Symmetry: D2
Subunit: 258 residues, 4 copies
């Protein structure tokens, strides 16, 4: 199996990476960061996110593993003390898959893939968009912005906005509001909305057409936008799992007590 390892870049992670590389040398494993089948991230969830986006053109060929050298992460859910055991079993595991979010931006097309979420805010002044669900005008949103989250992304920005946590086996996306204006004149639903596969949520500008669009860590300013279109991606991220670490236990460990 070809493999590669990204590191957070501090002393802890680089030395752990060099030790795992040395451990992999004692087996029949070839280090290749061009066409790896196994991508190991050492650091935190942000390190894992960058690893995912480095190889998002070969998602169907890769199994990801995360090692957290800091606190417990939702994607980096292996302890550094287990790195040797990881090297052992990695050289011959079952795969689990999580859904992803497709974002399409049109001008007068660019598509992005998100593992956590995709957000939209205004660049110049007030944020006003018409929210269209499966070609049906649903609401005119006025506020700070909107956030569309994957299932595994619900524990991240989605959670801080009041969204629900949903198990990653559910093929869905969740839309949450950012500081909406609600009075007798302006009306939004308020509640988070959970959409299934094949449902298309479209954002269409009213006045201003420039928007700051974020996809996970990446945040780009887009000008002369005609439409922002969300849907559950056809592609999935594949993890290499070696033990039972249930999602709800990861949620407990991160937010209740560990």
């Amino acid at each position: 199996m070809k493999y590669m390892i990204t590191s957070k870049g501090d002393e802890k992670s680089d030395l752990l990476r060099l030790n795992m590389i040395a451990g992999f040398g004692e087996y029949d494993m070839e280090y290749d960061d061009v066409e790896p089948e196994i991508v190991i991230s050492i650091g935190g969830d942000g390190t894992f996110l960058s690893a995912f986006h480095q190889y998002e053109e070969r998602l169907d060929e890769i199994a990801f593993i995360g090692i957290h050298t800091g606190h417990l992460g939702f994607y980096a859910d292996w302890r550094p003390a287990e790195a040797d055991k990881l090297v052992k079993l990695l050289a011959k595991y079952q795969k689990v898959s999580y859904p992803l979010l497709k974002t399409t931006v049109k001008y007068g097309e660019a598509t992005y893939l998100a593992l956590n979420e995709s957000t939209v805010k205004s660049s110049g002044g007030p944020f006003v968009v018409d929210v269209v669900i499966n070609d049906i005008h649903f609401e005119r949103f006025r506020g700070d912005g909107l956030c569309m989250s994957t299932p595994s992304g619900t524990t991240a920005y989605n959670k801080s906005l009041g969204g629900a946590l949903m198990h990653p086996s559910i093929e869905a996306m969740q839309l949450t509001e950012m500081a909406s204006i609600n009075n007798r004149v302006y009306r939004t639903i308020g509640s988070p909305l959970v959409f299934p596969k094949h449902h298309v949520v479209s954002l269409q500008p009213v006045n201003d057409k420039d928007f700051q669009i974020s996809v996970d860590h990446l945040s780009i300013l887009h000008r002369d936008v005609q439409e922002i279109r969300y849907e559950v991606s056809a592609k999935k991220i594949h993890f290499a799992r070696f033990r039972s670490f249930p999602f709800w236990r990861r949620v407990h460990d991160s937010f209740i007590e560990d």
Copy 2:
């Protein structure tokens, strides 16, 4: 086809029912409230809920239709002026199905079926339960109570508690909190939780073992409770649909503007 019609019992609904019965007489339709295949509710969503629970032993044999003589309802989504057209097509439609919630209460077993939600509060004093997810202890909840909602139930009590609205094609259940106590000593997740099929959420008492349990409109006091167990039911409610009235449009009509 055998059929029956329940009415809210006011003048508006009873007269509409008698007119539909007369209209059905002009076809080959036999009124039977014992083994109907078509159950028509005339009134509101509460009238529809009672109709559902009257015949929950024959859910697989029945297609439900709701007529709202008051405001627009989420289950009663036909206007009274369309009753004649309803009678026409009902005598020879496709069926749509929504998931349901199974509640199991154990003592020292009773099972219930919910179309909207099932809630738990304390009878004598403070409400404290341990929340167990797939045999994993998740949290110790202290507050007013908890609510487990079906997908179509998310627009009802679940919404008032801050839960997400989710499309009824998703086979899931959603747990929301009622006024939880959170300090350095007591910790709950806070966020709504969305569970897929085959996940089991179990509530287990800590001190008091008497609970007020509600299932849709029905609210019963239970004594010496050992466990409350939630899961997505294997059974579904079947609707008779004659036109496209999308769920998200029903949501818009009920909460944004109609």
Copy 3:
């Protein structure tokens, strides 16, 4: 000075009480639980609440002190290890005062005093009341109920309902909602409301006239209610303070870290 001491009634608190009584005997202090000028509560905030309500007819004559034998309390904010130092200075301190909430219930009048909050829920079925502010009809509330909190009460039930914490030097009361129904037909403000002195908030029934009314720990069923009237009381609770323990530090210690 006359004094008295209430105890939570467990072994820890009773033995601490007997030791303080013995310590007070070594000074010129007379134990009197009929007309005390100093009321010492040993236990938790609930023990302090009962002490407050035991002597609410002589609030202007008494200075209260709380000792927490369990976790840090907002009213019982002395450690048991400081009981000897407390006895010393108590025998000759400055006084601080917190505002209180007056509740008036009318039938076809009973007045109550609250240190934390006063809540209203329905007894038989759905809760619907008209909210009147200084004789101006403000809203028709439909939901689980309402909560009116004192400033020091904002850290208690008010906090679990999403209310703001406000410093107890502000003579005000705060009204929060319990699971309100909001659609195109039914509309509430949603936000917590903070009222100054001399503002009167009145709740008036629409259909059902029986309500479960709570005042701190005390919860009574009232029948044939015509009006529930809230206002900031003219009376205040007086504390004996011996050191600087700021409210915001108590908030930090209870909810952030201690």
Copy 4:
């Protein structure tokens, strides 16, 4: 009396302004936009905000009046059809005063006055600040940002963030959170905080020292910030009131029904 009139600049407002100027000419009133004692705003609340900030150096010399040519505003609470009656009584009224918020920014000092609120967000990346209350370290906030609101400002951005509405007779300020991160590692209070006069809330950077600071409509990027300090201002805005239009009625008219 000297007076001046600002206009939203559309056809409706300019023509109303010219008519009021003509009406004022029929009395002994001198138009002076340098040292006016009466400042009339015609348009919306944003027009009123600009009028307030045009003359914030002479707040003690001026009485403000707002006319809303669009929907009902919280500061512009006179209808255009009443402009003639306004001119009449304005030429010889009692004054009401609302508290204001003082913001002080320090580098390696600039002070601002807010009628609605003052917000802080990050410019480059993640927002992390230490919140200090009266020199006591209260929390380390991580999220999108923070908002400190005046009493009359509570109906504006503060409301969209979940803050409480408080009557403008209360001399206070309210701090609300923007999408805070809360887990076992990072902890914020969550609830809105209401501070009285003479309480000082200080924000102190942890890593990044560049912040986007907004004061009402005005939003400025500040670099190398050492401290952001909030307190209730000693100065107040004075309104000219001619009739009883209670704050809670304005709240009802804007959010419940008008």
